Structure 1
Amino acid sequence: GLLSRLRKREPISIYDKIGGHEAIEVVVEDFYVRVLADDQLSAFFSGTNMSRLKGKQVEFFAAALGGPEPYTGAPMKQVHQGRGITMHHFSLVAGHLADALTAAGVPSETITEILGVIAPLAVDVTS
């Protein structure tokens, strides 16, 4: 945990500073509510088991932000390639993530830092 990490003089991760696994679960749950309510995005997920997805996204996001949990999903490029996702869509999705983080009380400077980790993924994500 964070306590063990500090005893080792390791710098505090994003994961840790926004409240760890519990914080990410809440964010991700709110994130997909948003994404699915956006008529510009919802159809991409028409064939999706959202429980399973949200489960994989919690793992992905935790690991991306420094958490110790394994990501058990498929690679980003493979999953998204072929889906006709443009930068327009990716940006919309990013906005809902920022919104969810905002809603959970994450400081805006930290949300910017998180967007900094996620933005480069668009390379793998967009058509």
Structure 2
Amino acid sequence: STLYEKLGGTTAVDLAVDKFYERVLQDDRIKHFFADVDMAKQRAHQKAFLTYAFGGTDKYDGRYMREAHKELVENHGLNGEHFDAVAEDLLATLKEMGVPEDLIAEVAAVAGAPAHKRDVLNQ
């Protein structure tokens, strides 16, 4: 039911979040969206993205998502291409960790949920 059950406990979740953070950090498509934020904050974001994706959606109200990403949309040019890149990066990380493909699809449908994409992009 929770993230730690899905992935096999606290080490495993740390592994997932660290790998995801590392991949986004190296991704020239999206790294500039975090340029005005420190490294702990960037990590906390990848944790939040992953947590959401695994189905702790309820922590993140769409109204809060709209507001949280508004400056990205208005000031950094955030668009659907960038959105898809973060989601892609998560799935690549999970695949590298050995996460079963059925779990990967579950999380991909949540991470790329049209309602969430609309909120994040302020559409």
In the alignment, structure 2 segments of 5+ residues that lack a partner are none
Q: Tell me the CA shift for residue 14 of structure 1.
A: 6.1
2:117 pairs with one of 85, 99, 122:
122
Q: Pick 1 or 2: higher relative contact order, CA cutoff 8 A, min separation 6.
A: 2
Q: Tell me the CA shift for residue 64 of structure 1.
A: 5.5
**Counterpart position of 1:7:** none
Which is greater in Rg? 1
1:32 pairs with one of 5, 16, 21:
21
1:111 pairs with one of 104, 108, 114:
104
Aligned residues: 111
Higher helix fraction (1 or 2): 2
Q: Tell me the distance in 2 between the aligned counterparts of 1:90 and 1:27.
A: 19
Provide the aligned C-alpha RMSD in A. 2.6
Query: Which contiguous aligned blocks of 4+ residues in structure 1 show a shift greater than 4 angstroms?
Result: none
Q: Deviations over 1:77-102 (max 9, x none)?
A: 21111312111001111110001111
Q: Tell me the distance in 1 between the aligned counterparts of 2:43 and 2:71.
A: 21
Q: Tell me the CA shift for residue 20 of structure 1.
A: 4.0
User: What TM-score, normalized to structure 1?
Assistant: 0.71
Q: Percent identity?
A: 35
**Counterpart position of 2:47:** 58
Q: Tell me the distance in 2 between the aligned counterparts of 1:115 and 1:77.
A: 20
Letter paired with 1:43? H
